Amino acid sequence: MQEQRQQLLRSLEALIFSSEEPVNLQTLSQITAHKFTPSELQEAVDELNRDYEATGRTFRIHAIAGGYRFLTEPEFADLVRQLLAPVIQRRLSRSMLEVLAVVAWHQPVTKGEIQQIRGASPDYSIDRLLARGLIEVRGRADSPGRPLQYGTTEVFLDLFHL
């Protein structure tokens, strides 16, 4: 029964590792065709984590809200940050989101108006949002030069499940 236990342990590892979403007790028991008890499953996970600690692996399995998933050790948090969220990427993401937020709330709104509310540089967020179909022109403001006013799109609403 040692081998069977080890093979079952290997199967859990492969499933949790392959998962593109936290995997629960129900899913793991159905696929391994093993009637895992909540306590038995956690015990198997503990053993794997013990082996990771033993062999010097940089990741661990975590039980988050009933779903197990791998996470890298806090020791490499800075490195992971530079990979998943480098500064420049964060700047682009933040700026697009903030401008989008201003449009969502103040629409119909002009570039000049968005600038006033934000107090920016300004930048190319409007062009980026238009190129992605998240905002569109709603008309022209009644002000000097009749600047274009923007509003969010059904494309934006559908995507964000509003």
Place this chain on the structure above:
Amino acid sequence: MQEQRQQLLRSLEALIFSSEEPVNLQTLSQITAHKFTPSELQEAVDELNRDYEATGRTFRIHAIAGGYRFLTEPEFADLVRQLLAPVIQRRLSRSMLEVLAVVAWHQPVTKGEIQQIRGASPDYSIDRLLARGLIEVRGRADSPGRPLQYGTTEVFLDLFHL
């Protein structure tokens, strides 16, 4: 040639009206199989807008950056706002976007931390963003109670073309 002109005018209306995107001179000339000059096209559009004014229609064709599209008259701007962007919808949209923005910039970040930065109520923005796959857990903070930290997802990045 009156009938041909009128039929061509009707075709332009139908195309511009059906468009789910501003339609340019190139597209309109290819579909109507008519070699429109930039001046001739604007003149046809002016005639249609004259008929809209004459019959009391609530919309007009506008030339925005080389693309023509229908827009409703400013006289009904308030009504249109209540339809396309009612207050409650705007609140949901803004809150989700602002929290998303805070995560994009401050990740990995906890709910407590997001609250501090925003100075909110708080709300259910994190749950909403998790349910949409835009954010995910990155680990647990080194603070009392070890609260979950969040970060954006490749799903978010791919969707926003980062």
